[PDB]
């Protein structure tokens, strides 16, 4: 059922924000601060920024109708990272590590 799916999505998000994954999850906790970092073209390349704090809000306020909507936002956050950055950048490697955690937990959802 849809409500059961979202309860499991809450657990996945809790796992992505947990201390065990912090070494690679931290660049995704908050929006990219393009202005402070001097990434002048970030909002030109990334039309729909996404981060775990936004996913946390949409989950708390029940803005996701189903698990697929939650998965779309999480994957959009990783896709933005792959889209913007060169493949050798440390953040791209951190995103792949966190995405392996998300994809595993999302696939194992009962
Ligand atoms: C081609 C150029 N790319 C970028 O400099 C770039 C930066 C980022 C960051 C990012 C956001 C912050 S923050 O201060 O905003 C909040 C924490 C701080 C560091 C960040 O990255 C770094 C990381 C993760 C490790 C070492 C060095 C840096 C600059 C996030 N994400 C998701 C990106 O895609 C992205 N790209």
End-to-end CA distance of the chain: 10
Q: What is the CATH number of the domain that holds 101?
A: 1.20.920.10
User: In degrees to the nearest 10, what's the CA dihedral of 92, 78, 34, 93?
Assistant: -10
Q: Experimental technique used?
A: X-ray
For residue 16, count CB atoms less than 10 angstroms from its CB and return exposed for 0-12, middle for 13-18, buried for 19 or more: buried
Report d(CA 102, CA 97) in Å as an integer. 9
Instruction: Please report, for residues 53, 66, 71, 85, the alpha-carbon distance to residue 59 in angstroms, rounded to integers and kept in the order given.
Output: 10, 10, 12, 27
Closest alpha carbon to 53 in 23, 84, 16? 16
Give the C-alpha separation, 29 to 4, whole Å: 25
Q: What angle do CA 32, 8, 52 make, to 5 degrees?
A: 5
Widest pairwise Cα distance in the chain: 45
**Token pair for residue 97?**
């590590």
Q: Give residues (CB < 6 A) around ligand 1.
A: 27-28, 30, 32-33, 37, 39, 81, 84-85, 89-91
Residue of 21, 42, 51, 91 best suited for mutating to test ligand 1, as the one with most atoms within 8 Å of CB: 91
The CA-based dihedral angle spanning residues 36, 72, 10, 55, taken in that order and rounded to the nearest 10 degrees: 20
Count the domains in the chain.
1
Q: Which domain covers residue 4, as residue numbers? A: 1-110
- Whether residue 80 contacts residue 46, with contact meaning beta carbons closer than 8 Å, is answered with yes
Q: Which residue has the tokens 């803005």?
A: 63
Resolution in units of Å: 1.9
């Amino acid at each position: 059922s849809h409500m059961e799916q979202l309860k499991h999505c809450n657990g996945i998000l809790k796992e992505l924000l947990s201390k065990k994954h912090a070494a690679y999850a931290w660049p995704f906790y908050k929006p990219v601060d393009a202005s402070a970092l001097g990434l002048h073209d970030y909002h030109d390349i990334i039309k729909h920024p996404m981060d775990l704090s936004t996913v946390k809000r949409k989950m708390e306020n029940r803005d996701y109708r189903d698990a697929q909507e939650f998965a779309a936002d999480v994957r959009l956050m990783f896709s933005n990272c792959y889209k913007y950055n060169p493949p050798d950048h440390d953040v791209v490697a951190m995103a792949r590590k966190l995405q392996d955690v998300f994809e595993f937990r999302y696939a194992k959802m009962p």
